[PDB]
Coordinates of C-alpha atoms and ligand atoms in Angstrom, one line a residue:
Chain A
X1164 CA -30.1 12.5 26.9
X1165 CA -28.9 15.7 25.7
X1166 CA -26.1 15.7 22.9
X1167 CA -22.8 17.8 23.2
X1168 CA -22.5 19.7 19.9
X1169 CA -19.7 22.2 19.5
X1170 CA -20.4 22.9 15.2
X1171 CA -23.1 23.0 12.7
X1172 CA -22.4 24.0 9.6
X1173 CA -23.3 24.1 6.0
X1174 CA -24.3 23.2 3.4
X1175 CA -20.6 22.8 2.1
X1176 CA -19.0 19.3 0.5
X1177 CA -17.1 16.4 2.1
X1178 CA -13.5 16.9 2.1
X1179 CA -12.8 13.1 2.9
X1180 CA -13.2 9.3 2.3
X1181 CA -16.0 7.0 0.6
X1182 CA -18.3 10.2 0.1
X1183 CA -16.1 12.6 -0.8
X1184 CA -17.8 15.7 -2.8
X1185 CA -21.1 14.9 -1.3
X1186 CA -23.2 18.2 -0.6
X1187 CA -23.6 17.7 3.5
X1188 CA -23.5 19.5 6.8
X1189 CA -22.2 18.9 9.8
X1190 CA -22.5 18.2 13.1
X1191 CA -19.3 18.2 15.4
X1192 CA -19.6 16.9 18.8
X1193 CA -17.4 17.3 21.7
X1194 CA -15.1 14.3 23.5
X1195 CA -12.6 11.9 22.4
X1196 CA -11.3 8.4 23.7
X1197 CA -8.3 9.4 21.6
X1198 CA -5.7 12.3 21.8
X1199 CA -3.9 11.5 18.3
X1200 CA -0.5 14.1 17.7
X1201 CA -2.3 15.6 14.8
X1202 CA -5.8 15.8 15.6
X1203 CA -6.9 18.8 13.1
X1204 CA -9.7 19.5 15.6
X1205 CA -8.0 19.1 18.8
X1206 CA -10.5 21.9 20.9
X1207 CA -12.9 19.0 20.6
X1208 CA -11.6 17.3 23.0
X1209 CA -7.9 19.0 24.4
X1210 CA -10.6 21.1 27.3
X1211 CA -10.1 24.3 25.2
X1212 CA -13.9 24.9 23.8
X1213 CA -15.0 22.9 26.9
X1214 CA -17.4 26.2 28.1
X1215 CA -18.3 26.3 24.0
X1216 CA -20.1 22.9 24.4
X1217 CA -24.3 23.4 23.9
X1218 CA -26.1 20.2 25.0
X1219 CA -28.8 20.1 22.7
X1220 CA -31.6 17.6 21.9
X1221 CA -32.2 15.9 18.6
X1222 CA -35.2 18.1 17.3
X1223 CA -32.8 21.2 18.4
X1224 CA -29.8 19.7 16.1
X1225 CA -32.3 19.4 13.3
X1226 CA -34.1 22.8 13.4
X1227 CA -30.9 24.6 13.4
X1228 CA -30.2 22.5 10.8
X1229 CA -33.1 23.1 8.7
X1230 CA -32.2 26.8 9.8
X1231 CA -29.2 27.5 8.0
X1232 CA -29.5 24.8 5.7
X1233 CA -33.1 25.1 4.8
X1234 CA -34.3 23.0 2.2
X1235 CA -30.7 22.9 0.6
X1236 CA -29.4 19.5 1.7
X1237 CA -30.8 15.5 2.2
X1238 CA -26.9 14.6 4.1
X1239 CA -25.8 15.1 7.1
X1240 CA -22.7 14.0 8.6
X1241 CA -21.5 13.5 12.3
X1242 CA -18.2 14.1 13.2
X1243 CA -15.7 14.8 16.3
X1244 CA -14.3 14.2 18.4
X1245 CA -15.6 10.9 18.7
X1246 CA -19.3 10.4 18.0
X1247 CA -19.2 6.8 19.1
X1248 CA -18.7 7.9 22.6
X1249 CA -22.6 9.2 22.7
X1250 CA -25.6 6.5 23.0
X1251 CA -28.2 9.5 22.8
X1252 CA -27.0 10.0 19.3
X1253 CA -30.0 7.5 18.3
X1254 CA -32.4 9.7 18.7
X1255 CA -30.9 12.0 16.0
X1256 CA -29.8 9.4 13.6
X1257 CA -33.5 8.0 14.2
X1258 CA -35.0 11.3 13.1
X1259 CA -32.6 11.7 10.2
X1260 CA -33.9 8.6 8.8
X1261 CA -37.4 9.7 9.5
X1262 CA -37.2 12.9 7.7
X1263 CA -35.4 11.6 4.3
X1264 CA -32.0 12.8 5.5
X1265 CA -28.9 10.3 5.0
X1266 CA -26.5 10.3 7.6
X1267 CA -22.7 9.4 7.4
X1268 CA -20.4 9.0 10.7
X1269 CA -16.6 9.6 11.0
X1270 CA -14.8 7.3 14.1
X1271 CA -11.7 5.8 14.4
X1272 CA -13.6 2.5 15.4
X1273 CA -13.1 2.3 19.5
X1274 CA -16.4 2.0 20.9
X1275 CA -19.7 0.2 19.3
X1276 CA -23.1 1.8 19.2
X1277 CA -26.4 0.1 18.0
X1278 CA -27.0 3.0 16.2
X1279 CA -24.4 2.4 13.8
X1280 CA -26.9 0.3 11.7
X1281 CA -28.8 3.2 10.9
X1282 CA -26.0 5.2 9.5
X1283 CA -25.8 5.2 5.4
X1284 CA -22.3 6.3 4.9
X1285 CA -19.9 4.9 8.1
X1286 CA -16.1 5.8 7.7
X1287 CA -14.1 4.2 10.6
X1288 CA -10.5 5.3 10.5
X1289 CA -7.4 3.4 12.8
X1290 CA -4.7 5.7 13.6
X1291 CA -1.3 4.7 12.6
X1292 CA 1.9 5.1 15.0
X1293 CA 2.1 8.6 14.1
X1294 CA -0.8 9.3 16.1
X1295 CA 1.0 8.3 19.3
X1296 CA -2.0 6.1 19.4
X1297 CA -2.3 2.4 19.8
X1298 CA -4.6 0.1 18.1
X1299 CA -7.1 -1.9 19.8
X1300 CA -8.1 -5.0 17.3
X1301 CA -9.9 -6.5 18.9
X1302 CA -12.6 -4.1 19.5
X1303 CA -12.3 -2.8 15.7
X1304 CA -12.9 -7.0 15.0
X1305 CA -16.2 -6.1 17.2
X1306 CA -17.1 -3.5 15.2
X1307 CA -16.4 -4.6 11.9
X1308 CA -18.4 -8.2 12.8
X1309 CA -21.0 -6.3 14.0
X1310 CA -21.9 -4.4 11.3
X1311 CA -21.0 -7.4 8.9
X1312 CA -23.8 -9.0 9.9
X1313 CA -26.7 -6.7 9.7
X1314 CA -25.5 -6.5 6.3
X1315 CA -24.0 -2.8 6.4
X1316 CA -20.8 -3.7 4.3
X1317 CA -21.9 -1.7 1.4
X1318 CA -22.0 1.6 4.0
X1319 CA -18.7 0.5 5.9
X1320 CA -15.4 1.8 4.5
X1321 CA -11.9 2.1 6.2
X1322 CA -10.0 5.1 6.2
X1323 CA -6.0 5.3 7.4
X1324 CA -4.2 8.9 7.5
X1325 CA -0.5 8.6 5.9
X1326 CA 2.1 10.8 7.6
X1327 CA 4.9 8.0 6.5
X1328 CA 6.7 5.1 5.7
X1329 CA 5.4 3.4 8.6
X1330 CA 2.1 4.8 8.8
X1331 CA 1.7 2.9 5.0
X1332 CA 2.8 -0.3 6.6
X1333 CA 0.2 -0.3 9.4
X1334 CA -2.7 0.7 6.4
X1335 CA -1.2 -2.4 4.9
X1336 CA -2.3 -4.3 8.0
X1337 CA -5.4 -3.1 8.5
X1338 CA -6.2 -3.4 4.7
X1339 CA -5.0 -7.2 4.6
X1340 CA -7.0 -8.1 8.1
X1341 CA -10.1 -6.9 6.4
X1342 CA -10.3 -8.1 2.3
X1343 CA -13.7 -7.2 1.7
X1344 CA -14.2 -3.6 3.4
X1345 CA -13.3 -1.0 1.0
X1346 CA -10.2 0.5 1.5
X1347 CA -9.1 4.7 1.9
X1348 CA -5.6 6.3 2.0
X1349 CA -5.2 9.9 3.6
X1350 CA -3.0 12.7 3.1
X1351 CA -1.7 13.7 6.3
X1352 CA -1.6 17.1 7.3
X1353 CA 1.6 18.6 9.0
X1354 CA 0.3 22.3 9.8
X1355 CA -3.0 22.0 11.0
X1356 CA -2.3 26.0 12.7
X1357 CA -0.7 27.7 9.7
X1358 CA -2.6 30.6 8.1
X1359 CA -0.9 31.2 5.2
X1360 CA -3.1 28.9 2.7
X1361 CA -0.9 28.8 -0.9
X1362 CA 2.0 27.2 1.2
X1363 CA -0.4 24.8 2.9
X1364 CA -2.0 24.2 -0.5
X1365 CA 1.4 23.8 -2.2
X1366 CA 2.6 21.5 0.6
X1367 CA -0.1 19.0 0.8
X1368 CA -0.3 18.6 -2.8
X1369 CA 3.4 17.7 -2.8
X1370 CA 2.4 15.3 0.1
X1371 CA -0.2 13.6 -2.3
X1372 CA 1.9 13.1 -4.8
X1373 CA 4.7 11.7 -2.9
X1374 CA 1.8 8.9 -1.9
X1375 CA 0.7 8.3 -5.2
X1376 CA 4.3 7.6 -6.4
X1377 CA 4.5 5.1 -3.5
X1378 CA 1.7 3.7 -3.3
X1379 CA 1.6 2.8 -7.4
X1380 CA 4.5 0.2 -6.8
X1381 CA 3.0 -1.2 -4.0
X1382 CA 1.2 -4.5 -5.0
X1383 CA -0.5 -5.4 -1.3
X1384 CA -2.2 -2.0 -1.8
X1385 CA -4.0 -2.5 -5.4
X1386 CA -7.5 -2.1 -4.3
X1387 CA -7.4 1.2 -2.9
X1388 CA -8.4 4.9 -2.9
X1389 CA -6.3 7.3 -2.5
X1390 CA -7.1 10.9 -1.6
X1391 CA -6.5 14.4 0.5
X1392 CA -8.4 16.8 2.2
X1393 CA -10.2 18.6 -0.5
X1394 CA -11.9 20.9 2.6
X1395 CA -7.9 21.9 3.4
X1396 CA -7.3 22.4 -0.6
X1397 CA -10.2 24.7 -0.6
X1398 CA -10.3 26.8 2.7
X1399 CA -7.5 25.6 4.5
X1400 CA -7.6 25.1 8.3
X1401 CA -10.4 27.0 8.4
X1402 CA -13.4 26.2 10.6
X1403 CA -17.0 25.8 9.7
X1404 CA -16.2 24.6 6.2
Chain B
X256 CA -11.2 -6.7 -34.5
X257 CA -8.5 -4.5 -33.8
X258 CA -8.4 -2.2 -31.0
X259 CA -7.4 1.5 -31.9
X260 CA -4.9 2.2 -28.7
X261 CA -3.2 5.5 -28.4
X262 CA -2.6 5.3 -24.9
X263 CA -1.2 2.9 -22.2
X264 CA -0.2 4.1 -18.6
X265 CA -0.2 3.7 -15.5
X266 CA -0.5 2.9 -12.2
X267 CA -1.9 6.2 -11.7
X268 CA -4.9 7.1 -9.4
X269 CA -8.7 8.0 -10.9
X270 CA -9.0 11.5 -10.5
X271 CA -12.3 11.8 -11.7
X272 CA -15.7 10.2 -10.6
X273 CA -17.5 7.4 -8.7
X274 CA -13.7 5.8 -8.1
X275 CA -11.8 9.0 -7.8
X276 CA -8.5 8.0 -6.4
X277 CA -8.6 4.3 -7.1
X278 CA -5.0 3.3 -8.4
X279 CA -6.0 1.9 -12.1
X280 CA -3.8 1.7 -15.2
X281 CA -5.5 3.5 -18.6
X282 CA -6.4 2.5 -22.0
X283 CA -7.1 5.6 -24.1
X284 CA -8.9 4.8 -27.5
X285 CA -9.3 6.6 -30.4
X286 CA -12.4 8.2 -32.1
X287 CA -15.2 10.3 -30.9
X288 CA -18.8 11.3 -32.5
X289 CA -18.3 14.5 -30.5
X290 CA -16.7 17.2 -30.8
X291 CA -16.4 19.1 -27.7
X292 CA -15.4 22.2 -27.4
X293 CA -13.2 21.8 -24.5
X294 CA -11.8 18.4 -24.7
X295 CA -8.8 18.2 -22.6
X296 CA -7.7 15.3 -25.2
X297 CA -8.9 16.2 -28.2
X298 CA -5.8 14.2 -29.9
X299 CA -7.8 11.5 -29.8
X300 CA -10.2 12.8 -32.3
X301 CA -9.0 16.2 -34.2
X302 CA -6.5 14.0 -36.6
X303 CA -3.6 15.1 -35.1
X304 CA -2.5 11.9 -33.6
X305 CA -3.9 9.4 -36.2
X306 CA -0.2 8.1 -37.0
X307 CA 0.2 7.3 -33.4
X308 CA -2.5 4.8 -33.1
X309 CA -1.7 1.4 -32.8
X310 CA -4.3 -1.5 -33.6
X311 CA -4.1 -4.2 -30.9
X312 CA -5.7 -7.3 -29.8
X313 CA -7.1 -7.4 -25.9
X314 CA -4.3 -9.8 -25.5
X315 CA -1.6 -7.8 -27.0
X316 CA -3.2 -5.1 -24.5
X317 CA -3.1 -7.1 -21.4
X318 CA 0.2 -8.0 -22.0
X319 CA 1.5 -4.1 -22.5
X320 CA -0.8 -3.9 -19.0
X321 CA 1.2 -6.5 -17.1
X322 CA 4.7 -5.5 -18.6
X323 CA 4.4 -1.7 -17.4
X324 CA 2.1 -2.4 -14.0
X325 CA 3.1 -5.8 -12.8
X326 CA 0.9 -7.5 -10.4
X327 CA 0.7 -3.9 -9.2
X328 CA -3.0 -3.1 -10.5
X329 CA -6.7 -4.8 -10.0
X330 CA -8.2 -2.2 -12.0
X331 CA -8.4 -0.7 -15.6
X332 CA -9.7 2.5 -16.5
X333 CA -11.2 2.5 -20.6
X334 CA -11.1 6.6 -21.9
X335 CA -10.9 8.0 -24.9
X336 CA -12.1 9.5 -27.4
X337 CA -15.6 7.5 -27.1
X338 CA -14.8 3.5 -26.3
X339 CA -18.6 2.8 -27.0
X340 CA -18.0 3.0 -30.7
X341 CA -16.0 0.0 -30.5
X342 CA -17.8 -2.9 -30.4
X343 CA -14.4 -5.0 -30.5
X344 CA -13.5 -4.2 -27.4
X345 CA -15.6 -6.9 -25.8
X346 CA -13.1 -9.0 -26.1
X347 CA -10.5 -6.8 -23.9
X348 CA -13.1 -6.5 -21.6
X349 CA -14.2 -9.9 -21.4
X350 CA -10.3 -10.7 -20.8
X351 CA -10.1 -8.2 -17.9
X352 CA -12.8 -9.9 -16.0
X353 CA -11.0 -13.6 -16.7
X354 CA -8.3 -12.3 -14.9
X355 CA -9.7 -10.7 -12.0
X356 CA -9.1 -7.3 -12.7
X357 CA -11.7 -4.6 -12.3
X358 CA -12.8 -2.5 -15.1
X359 CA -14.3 1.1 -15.6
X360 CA -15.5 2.7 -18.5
X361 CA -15.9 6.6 -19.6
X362 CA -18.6 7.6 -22.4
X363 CA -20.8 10.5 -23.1
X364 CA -24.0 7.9 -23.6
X365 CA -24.7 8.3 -26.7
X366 CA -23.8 4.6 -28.1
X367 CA -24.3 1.6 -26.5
X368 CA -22.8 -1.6 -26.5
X369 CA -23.7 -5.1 -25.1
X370 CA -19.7 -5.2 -23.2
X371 CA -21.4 -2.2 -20.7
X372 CA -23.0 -4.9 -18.7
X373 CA -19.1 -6.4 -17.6
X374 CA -18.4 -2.4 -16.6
X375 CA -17.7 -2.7 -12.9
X376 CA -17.5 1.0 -12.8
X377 CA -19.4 2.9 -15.7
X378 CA -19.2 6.8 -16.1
X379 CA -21.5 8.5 -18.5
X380 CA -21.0 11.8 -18.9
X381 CA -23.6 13.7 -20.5
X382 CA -22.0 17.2 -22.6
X383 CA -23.7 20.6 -22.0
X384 CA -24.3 23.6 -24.0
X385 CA -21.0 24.9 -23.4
X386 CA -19.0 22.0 -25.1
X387 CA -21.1 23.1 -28.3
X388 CA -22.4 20.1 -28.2
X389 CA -26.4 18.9 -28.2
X390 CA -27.2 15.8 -26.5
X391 CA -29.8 13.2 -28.1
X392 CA -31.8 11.9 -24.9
X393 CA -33.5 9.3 -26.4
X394 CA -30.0 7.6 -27.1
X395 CA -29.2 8.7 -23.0
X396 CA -32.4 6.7 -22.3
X397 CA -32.0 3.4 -24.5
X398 CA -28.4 3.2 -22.4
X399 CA -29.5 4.0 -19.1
X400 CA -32.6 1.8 -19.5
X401 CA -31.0 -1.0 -20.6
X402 CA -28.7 -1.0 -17.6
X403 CA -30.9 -0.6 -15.0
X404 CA -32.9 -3.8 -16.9
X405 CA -29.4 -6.0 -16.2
X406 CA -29.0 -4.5 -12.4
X407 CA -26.3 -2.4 -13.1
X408 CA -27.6 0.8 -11.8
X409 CA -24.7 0.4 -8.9
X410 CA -21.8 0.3 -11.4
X411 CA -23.7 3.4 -13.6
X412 CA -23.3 6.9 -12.1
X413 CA -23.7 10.5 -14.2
X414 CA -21.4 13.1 -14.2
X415 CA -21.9 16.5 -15.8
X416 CA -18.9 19.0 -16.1
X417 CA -20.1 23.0 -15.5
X418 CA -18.3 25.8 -16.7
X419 CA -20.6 28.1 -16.1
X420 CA -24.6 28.7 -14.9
X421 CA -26.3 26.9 -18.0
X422 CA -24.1 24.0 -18.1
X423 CA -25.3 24.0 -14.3
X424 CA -29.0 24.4 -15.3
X425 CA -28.4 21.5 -18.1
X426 CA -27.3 19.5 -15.1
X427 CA -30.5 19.9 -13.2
X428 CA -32.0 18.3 -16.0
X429 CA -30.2 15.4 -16.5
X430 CA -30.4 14.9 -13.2
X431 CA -34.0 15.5 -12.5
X432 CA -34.7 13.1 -15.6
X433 CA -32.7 10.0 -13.8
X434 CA -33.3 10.4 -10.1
X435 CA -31.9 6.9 -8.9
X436 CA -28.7 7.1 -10.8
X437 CA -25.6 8.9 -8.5
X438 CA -25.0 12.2 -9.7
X439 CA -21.7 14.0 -10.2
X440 CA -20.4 17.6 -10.8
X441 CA -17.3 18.3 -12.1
X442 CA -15.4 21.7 -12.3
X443 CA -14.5 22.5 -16.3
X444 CA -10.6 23.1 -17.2
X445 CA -10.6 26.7 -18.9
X446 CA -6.4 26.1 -20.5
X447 CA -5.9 22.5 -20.9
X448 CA -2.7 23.8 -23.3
X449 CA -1.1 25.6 -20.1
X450 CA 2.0 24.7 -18.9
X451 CA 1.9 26.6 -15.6
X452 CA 0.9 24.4 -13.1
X453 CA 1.0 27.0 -10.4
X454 CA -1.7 29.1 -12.4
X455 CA -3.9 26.6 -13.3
X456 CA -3.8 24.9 -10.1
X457 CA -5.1 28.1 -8.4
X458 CA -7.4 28.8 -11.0
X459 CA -9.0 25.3 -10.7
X460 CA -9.5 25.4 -6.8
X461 CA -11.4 29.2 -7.2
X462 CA -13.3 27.4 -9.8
X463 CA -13.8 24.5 -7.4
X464 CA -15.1 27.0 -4.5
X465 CA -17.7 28.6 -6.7
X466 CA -19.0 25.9 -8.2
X467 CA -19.4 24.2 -4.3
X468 CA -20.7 27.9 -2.8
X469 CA -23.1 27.8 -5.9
X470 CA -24.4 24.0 -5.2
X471 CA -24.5 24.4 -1.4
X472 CA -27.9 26.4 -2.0
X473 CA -29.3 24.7 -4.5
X474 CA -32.2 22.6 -3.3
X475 CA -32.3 20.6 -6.4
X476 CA -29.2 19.5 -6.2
X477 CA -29.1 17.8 -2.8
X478 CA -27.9 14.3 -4.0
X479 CA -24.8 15.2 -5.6
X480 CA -20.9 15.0 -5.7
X481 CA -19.4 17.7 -6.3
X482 CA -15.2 16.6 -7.7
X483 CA -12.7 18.6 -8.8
X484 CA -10.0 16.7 -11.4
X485 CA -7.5 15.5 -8.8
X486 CA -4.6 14.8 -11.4
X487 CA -4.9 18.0 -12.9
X488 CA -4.1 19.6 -9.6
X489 CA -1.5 16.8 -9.9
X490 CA 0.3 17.0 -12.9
X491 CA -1.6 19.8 -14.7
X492 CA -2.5 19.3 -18.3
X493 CA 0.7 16.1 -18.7
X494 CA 0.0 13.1 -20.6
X495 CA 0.2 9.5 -19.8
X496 CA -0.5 10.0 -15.6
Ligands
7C5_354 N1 -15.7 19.8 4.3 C1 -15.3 19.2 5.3 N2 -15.2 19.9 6.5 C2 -14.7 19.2 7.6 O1 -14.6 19.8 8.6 C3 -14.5 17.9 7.5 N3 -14.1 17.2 8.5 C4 -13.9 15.9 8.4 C5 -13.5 15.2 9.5 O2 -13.3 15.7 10.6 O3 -13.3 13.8 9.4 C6 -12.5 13.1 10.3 C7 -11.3 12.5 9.7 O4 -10.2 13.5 9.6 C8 -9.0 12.7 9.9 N4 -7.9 13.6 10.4 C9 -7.8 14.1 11.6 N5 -6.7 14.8 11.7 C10 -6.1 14.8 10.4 C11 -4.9 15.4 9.9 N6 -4.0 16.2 10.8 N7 -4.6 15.2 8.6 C12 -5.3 14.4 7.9 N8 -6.5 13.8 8.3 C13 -6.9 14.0 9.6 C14 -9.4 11.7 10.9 O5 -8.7 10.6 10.7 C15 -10.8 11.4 10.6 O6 -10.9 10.2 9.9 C16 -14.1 15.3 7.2 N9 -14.5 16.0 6.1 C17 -14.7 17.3 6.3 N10 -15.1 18.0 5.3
7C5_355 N1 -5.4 10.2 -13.5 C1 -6.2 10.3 -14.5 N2 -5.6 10.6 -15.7 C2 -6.5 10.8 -16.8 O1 -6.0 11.0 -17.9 C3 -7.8 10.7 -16.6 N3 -8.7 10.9 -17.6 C4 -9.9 10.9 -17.4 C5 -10.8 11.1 -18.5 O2 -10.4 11.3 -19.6 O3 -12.2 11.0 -18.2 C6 -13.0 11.6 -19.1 C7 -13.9 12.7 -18.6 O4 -13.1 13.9 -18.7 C8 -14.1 14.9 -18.9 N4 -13.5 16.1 -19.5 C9 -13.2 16.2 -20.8 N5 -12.7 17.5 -21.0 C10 -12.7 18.2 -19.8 C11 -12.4 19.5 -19.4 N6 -11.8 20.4 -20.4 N7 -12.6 19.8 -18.1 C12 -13.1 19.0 -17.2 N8 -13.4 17.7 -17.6 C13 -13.3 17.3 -18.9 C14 -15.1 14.2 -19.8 O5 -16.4 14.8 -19.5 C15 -15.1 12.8 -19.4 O6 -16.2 12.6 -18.6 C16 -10.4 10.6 -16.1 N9 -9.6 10.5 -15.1 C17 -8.3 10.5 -15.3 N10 -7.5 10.3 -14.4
LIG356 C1 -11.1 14.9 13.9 S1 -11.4 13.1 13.7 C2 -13.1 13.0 14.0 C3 -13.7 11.6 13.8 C4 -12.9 10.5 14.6 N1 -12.4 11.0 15.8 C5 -11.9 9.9 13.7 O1 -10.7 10.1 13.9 O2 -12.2 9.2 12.7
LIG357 C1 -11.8 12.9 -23.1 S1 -13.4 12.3 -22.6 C2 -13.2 10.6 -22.8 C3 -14.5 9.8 -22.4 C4 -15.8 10.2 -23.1 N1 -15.4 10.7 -24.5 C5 -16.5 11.2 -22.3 O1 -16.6 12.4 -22.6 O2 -17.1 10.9 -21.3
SF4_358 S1 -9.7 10.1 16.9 FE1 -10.1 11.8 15.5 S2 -11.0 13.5 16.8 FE2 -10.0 12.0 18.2 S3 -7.9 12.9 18.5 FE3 -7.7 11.4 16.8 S4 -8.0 12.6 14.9 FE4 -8.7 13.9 16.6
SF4_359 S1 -17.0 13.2 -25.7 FE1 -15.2 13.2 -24.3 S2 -13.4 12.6 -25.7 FE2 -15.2 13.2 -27.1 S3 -14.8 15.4 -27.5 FE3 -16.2 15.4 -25.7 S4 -14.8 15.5 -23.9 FE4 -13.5 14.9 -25.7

């Protein structure tokens, strides 16, 4: 029953996707189905903050919460790792909901919870073939049905990191298999390690711009946002932002 | 029942807003009742681009639209200058919608027209104290009331720029006076004449970071974006992207 957190932080602003700029915190927790090449938070699941992990319950998650936070926040978001990996979650969504507190959910759309009904802001993200990973459809159909039909479509968005050419053909897939879920394009980050911030910044921005250009001629991708990691712009690699 | 049109581009992305980084092409009118004192396109109003506007009919405007983006665009983004003065441009509007493309609208609220109800997207942008402006509420309330009366209130959202702590304190108010509408922060360009990109772009982001450190303790501000402008860490103070 206990939950395997390894962050909480905030308040600070979401960097990414259908919410982006939204005063949150944030709750990380530990494990992932997935091991993509370019995880920016790889010690979530790569075994190296393995002895870091704190099983807490859900009124412990919310008092620290409310702790650092204090009265200065009605968002919370739950990140990874992959979240969608953890039934117990419910309880903590569930008391989100009963205190006021909207609560939005970053997965790359693998495994289905029940609780995923509950959450106001769900960003589900594929990884593209620069991610070394492959795509199960039919358990993102699943998902996607699923929450369809309990009329969460206005809270569902998709989300697809863009490395390169051919990572911007597989959004193109996933965008066309799914008309009516709104649509998000990534800048991929190469340097998820590097220190030196003004080259990151410099780099990524050159990045975005390069997808805008692209992505402008490209008539199968007309309803869709584009946008970087605004987290990354701001503090770079840094953790706990 | 011409349409005063100093600007055509695009595709471009949003870089502002409820639909930041939507790709959208831009129709820049001329005219504004204000007179801010950091208008980042003030050539719209100041008389010093008054040869350069072209009266056009929504088709004529369309047409430019299709030559220049192709089939490559499903939305439009309206700007000035203040659109709202023109009543005229129900017919462009009215068009748009006929031909499945998605339109958005920025205004400062402080005159309304019947074509707001066709916004899909509608941006009203209240000024503070420090763009020497003063804002007449009871116009902000005839708008925002009528819109909520035609259920609009999820294509309406309110975004306030800060430059500094009482353009942040007007904000509160604003916001405070229309809880249910979304509510959005937006950093204030200092040199929108500057030509180094570099500069600015570095300038902006420490902007950013204290405007997010500021709202991040701010208990009455829980319910808010907080957005940089993403094509001015793009392409700096440039024209026509
Ligand atoms: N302020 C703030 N602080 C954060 O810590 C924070 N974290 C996240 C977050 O972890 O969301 C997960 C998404 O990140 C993607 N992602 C992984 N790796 C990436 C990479 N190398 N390049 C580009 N994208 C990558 C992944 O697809 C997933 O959808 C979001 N917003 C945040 N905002
Ligand atoms: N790609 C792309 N190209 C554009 O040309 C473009 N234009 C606009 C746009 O004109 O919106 C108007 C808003 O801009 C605000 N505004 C004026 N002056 C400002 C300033 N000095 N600093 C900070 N904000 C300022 C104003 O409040 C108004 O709400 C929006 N998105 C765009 N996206
Ligand atoms: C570091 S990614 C965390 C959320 C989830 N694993 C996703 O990729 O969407
Ligand atoms: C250059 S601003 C253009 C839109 C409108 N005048 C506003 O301030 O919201
Ligand atoms: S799914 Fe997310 S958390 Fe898991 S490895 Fe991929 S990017 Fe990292
Ligand atoms: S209302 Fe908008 S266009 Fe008019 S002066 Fe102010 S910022 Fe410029």
């Amino acid at each position: 029953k206990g939950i395997p957190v390894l962050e909480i932080f905030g308040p600070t602003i979401q960097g990414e996707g259908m919410v982006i700029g939204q005063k949150t915190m944030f709750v990380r927790t530990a494990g992932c189905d997935y091991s993509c090449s370019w995880c920016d938070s790889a010690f979530t699941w790569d075994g190296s903050a393995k002895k870091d992990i704190r099983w807490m319950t859900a009124e412990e998650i919310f008092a620290e919460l409310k702790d650092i936070g204090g009265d200065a926040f009605s968002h919370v978001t739950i990140s990874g790792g992959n979240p969608a990996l953890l039934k117990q979650l419910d309880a903590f969504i569930e008391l989100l909901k009963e205190n006021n507190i909207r609560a939005a959910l970053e997965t790359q759309g693998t495994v289905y919870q029940d609780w995923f009904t509950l959450i106001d802001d769900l960003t589900i993200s594929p990884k593209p073939p620069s991610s070394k990973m492959v795509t199960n459809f039919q358990k993102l159909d699943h998902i996607l049905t699923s929450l369809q039909e309990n009329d969460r479509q206005h809270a569902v968005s998709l989300k697809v990191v863009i490395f390169n050419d051919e990572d911007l053909e597989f959004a193109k897939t996933v965008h066309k298999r799914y008309p009516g879920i709104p649509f998000y394009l990534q800048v991929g980050n190469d340097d998820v390690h590097t220190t030196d911030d003004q080259s990151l910044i410099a780099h990524l921005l050159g990045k975005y711009e390069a997808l805008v250009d692209k992505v402008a001629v490209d008539a199968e991708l007309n309803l869709v946002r584009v946008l970087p990691q605004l987290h990354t712009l701001l503090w770079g690699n840094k953790r706990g932002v």
